[PDB]
Assembly symmetry: D2
Homo-oligomer: 267 residues x 4
């Protein structure tokens, strides 16, 4: 077991197509004892997570709720038991209002919506680290989900800006995490066919947006020297578990690219 | 004159130590007709800008004020004359509340403060582009002021995150600017001894923060193969004018490093 | 005149489609006094360069010839006159044997051929800097021609590896150049339809290789927010002149992208 | 066992201080069946490798020897047995003549020495890939040792250029490796006190060189949020083993930084 007898918090499960679900699944398969956090639809998330190989306590976490973050460490300690600490934390949380994405013009996205997006997608990685580092063991690992924003691309728009902010936050979280002997890193995943992506490809945020994202997917597999399967989140999940493990102990404030090596090729 | 006959909006003058003041000065020296935008203390800015080689109309622009941005293009056209468009736009605007910087711990920065900082420092570049692109000529140039946030550093904290977000926004503005035949680029300047900068070195955001920024400055000059004078904004100002000129016509969504080449050296 | 009164050595003119020819043309148009350097076919280069706006002394330089480099500074001083120094140096030199490029498998390139390519394309930038820095004025500029090798691509193969080596060498040349008050920078140009480029598209280095280069140049124009005209070297030439000028005085060991902003966009 | 049942070739053991020795050690600890390759001093290498947890066949490989590379796959197949293939390949090979490093001026390095350096340090990664990919299983992994050359630094000089070339080669090897279902990645390690490094700090390549490398070391630990122990190669070894494992299956043509996160921080 890669994560044998490691206590790992996993956020960001909403459906069985969620990357976080596949992270949670592979984590438990490798002997990790999980604490799950969920947002808004808790009855749904509890039902979805019942299909995981092992049962895991589910805590409510809205990263925009200061009370939720303030109480989180206590609620996690209650779930995993007194005198026990976290060895792992997975940030798999991302949102951007429709106005900040798709055929909705880049300039027409009002800041109130962008701010909400940056709050949930970027700042939330710092606030999660703050809440949970006090209850994290030395040799611990914090991992966030990233989408390479080094270059602008159609439709992703302000979500790309939010990911650029996240990458920057990760490098600062790493500074703080370092004091606790804890690593902080992002996995830059290739495109994964979640509900949200499938909807976007289906034209949910306008036709050209779906068209450009479908062209982006196809270009991604073409470029990737080992190919890229957008319907298979397992390679991403295994990469998150690699960073949660003891086998990247000199990597922090950094980004691991689980993208089939697409970002290393132009074509 | 590098910018002979070019009409250029220049934001972000507050004092004569402002990078924007030195941009404005060098721009006018090179035959540019300037429109100035100023925030909050207009009587002050009007007095400061009277020392510029040529007199320039000063417009009020708070980038957080929706009415100011909505009205901006009209007020600019009124100043430069009907049937006349801008050839240049300088974003020299930046702010992060005290909580987002210095010895004020990175995790203790409330999002309301970080959001206000990202609004003025990152989003404002997109909203300035939205307002002004409709009144910009083909072959035009938009330039923003950047501080390399590729790597985390002490004290700069959430301002670095704000700069990471700005870099991402610039790449998207470039996509929109391209339709108007306009270029969008950032100048990544080295540390410049502004009033706010001197205050920070003086320990205005805590002793440890001032100590770290002073060590960062000294390391910057050491690394820079052509040295770095933090008391000389002229090389930064000349670099902005180079991007405002017709002499970088194939560069857009990009970053020019006016840092003495410090970012290209480890030491 | 951007380069009025400046004495600039320009290498790498072989035909009138050469980037160096357009660099030389734009430089002379901006009041630069040129020293030209040519390889092997001197009669040809002399004839081609007669079409430049002004006549310029032509010196033989094979960068693989130690005597040519040893004697260079002397021969340049004789041409521009004793007591006069160079203000500018353009490295527009590039070669990789057929085996190092095209459908010729990457692994099948003999090192003897790769080494010849790296010698001419990468090391020669350091060689030219060594020979010429002693006869260069303070505030001077050395500029090399680059093709972004940050990501691998089809056909370019070992030429990409050579460009990666050049980028690295440039950063070290900048350290040495710094002592002389001289800047060292690369222009990362987009694809330009030179004789060799046209031949390669025509299938000169195999059909599949020509097909991939044609898809690369087409993808380049699409990505570029301000488009990319591969038949127009003028934007590249103007960018070199910008670096040779006094208007990027805080940029060294660095890379300016004259690529229509293609490298800042994914699509 | 992380590498349970995996057959892995490991090059670049010369002493027990070698990074390759620690890679080899940690690999065997994790259930890997090793083939070792050695250069020049074979009686020494056999003696050194006797201290490894398990007995491993040692094959002679000079990467500059065409006969050695042509015969390698056969000699490896003989060692691991007919109908058995490699699941892993470790390139831990690096050399640059004294003239290419230290206080020996950057410009004074003759290309013959630089070419020899680039041959062993960069090209050899492609040579090993060519020889060994035919006898490598799907889901296989090739790993090379890298020192981040993204920024120039004192003393490392042409070895940095060689590492820049290696990074570029890796991205091309990945394209070829991809056809065999094999990944190709570099581990960018922080400075490790090998016999060679200890000698350099001792002033073996001049006093100023040793002084700069000692300042680089100390700055590295300072910057690294989780610190950096240059006397501990285990974190580098564990990182190579992570890439050799099945736990980074979507990472190829890429670079993993085993540097304490030093490359993510400025200070
Ligand atoms: N799907 C892709 O193609 C892709 C690629 C790379 C990176 N990512 C990143 O992966 C992460 C996971 O997203 P996904 O693709 O699995 O989609 P998803 O919708 O399944 O996951 C997003 C999660 O964010 C949670 N969330 C939203 N707002 C929240 C809030 N205020 N507080 C707490 N949780 C909140 C949702 O409940 C959900 O569980 C995101 O950070 C996303 O940006 C996505
Ligand atoms: N000084 C440095 O060391 C340094 C280094 C690199 C980049 N920069 C960047 O240079 C730019 C200019 O800053 P500076 O260093 O000249 O300092 P400065 O204080 O002189 O300039 C900042 C400007 O931002 C303006 N501003 C603040 N809030 C605003 C708002 N809501 N609407 C409109 N304008 C607003 C201020 O009025 C001021 O004119 C900033 O973007 C800064 O981040 C600074
Ligand atoms: N054409 C493109 O698409 C493109 C794109 C970006 C960068 N570049 C770079 O621009 C530079 C100029 O090449 P180009 O595209 O104008 O083609 P070109 O063939 O016109 O220029 C190459 C030049 O190299 C010279 N040269 C070759 N071997 C030499 C040697 N041993 N000593 C001295 N000079 C030697 C040739 O004589 C010729 O003048 C090269 O470095 C090339 O890699 C080209
Ligand atoms: N030690 C560091 O500070 C450091 C940091 C990062 C990366 N690296 C890289 O790690 C790798 C291993 O080097 P090291 O630091 O363990 O030092 P080392 O001297 O122990 O290892 C170098 C190895 O290269 C081998 N070698 C030299 N020429 C060869 C040839 N022609 N054919 C085959 N093998 C040959 C030597 O026999 C030796 O085993 C190198 O690629 C090095 O650049 C070193
Ligand atoms: O967030 C991302 O990066 C993917 C966009 N999406 O489908 O939610
Ligand atoms: O804003 C910056 O990037 C630096 C100057 N400052 O205000 O601290
Ligand atoms: O060298 C280059 O980058 C392009 C010139 N060429 O070989 O076609
Ligand atoms: O090879 C390296 O990068 C480490 C320097 N050294 O001691 O050989």
């Amino acid at each position: 077991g890669l994560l044998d007898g490691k206590r790992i918090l996993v956020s960001g499960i909403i459906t069985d197509s969620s990357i976080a679900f596949h992270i949670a699944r592979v984590a438990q398969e490798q002997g990790a004892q999980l604490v799950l956090t969920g947002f808004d639809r808790l009855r749904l998330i509890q039902r979805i997570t019942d299909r995981l190989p092992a049962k895991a306590p589910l805590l409510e976490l809205d990263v925009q709720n200061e009370e939720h973050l303030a109480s989180l460490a206590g609620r996690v300690t209650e779930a995993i038991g007194a005198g026990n600490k976290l060895d792992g934390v997975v940030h798999s949380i991302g949102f951007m209002p429709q106005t900040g994405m798709g055929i909705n013009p880049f300039f027409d996205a009002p800041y109130a919506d962008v701010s909400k997006g940056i709050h949930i997608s970027a700042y939330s990685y710092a606030s999660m680290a703050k809440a949970l580092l006090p209850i994290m063991n030395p040799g611990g690992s914090i991992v966030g989900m990233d989408f390479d924003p080094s270059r602008a691309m159609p439709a992703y728009n302000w979500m790309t800006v939010a990911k650029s902010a996240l990458e920057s936050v990760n490098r600062f979280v790493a500074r703080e995490a370092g004091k606790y002997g804890v690593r902080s890193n992002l996995v830059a995943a290739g495109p994964i066919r979640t509900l949200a992506m499938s909807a976007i490809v289906g034209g949910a945020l306008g036709e050209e947006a779906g068209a450009q994202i479908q062209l982006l997917e196809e270009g991604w597999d073409q470029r990737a020297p080992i190919g890229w399967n957008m319907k298979d989140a397992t390679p991403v999940a295994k990469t998150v578990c690699a960073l949660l493990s003891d086998w990247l102990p000199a990597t922090t404030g950094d980004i691991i690219y689980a993208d089939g090596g697409a970002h290393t090729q132009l074509l």
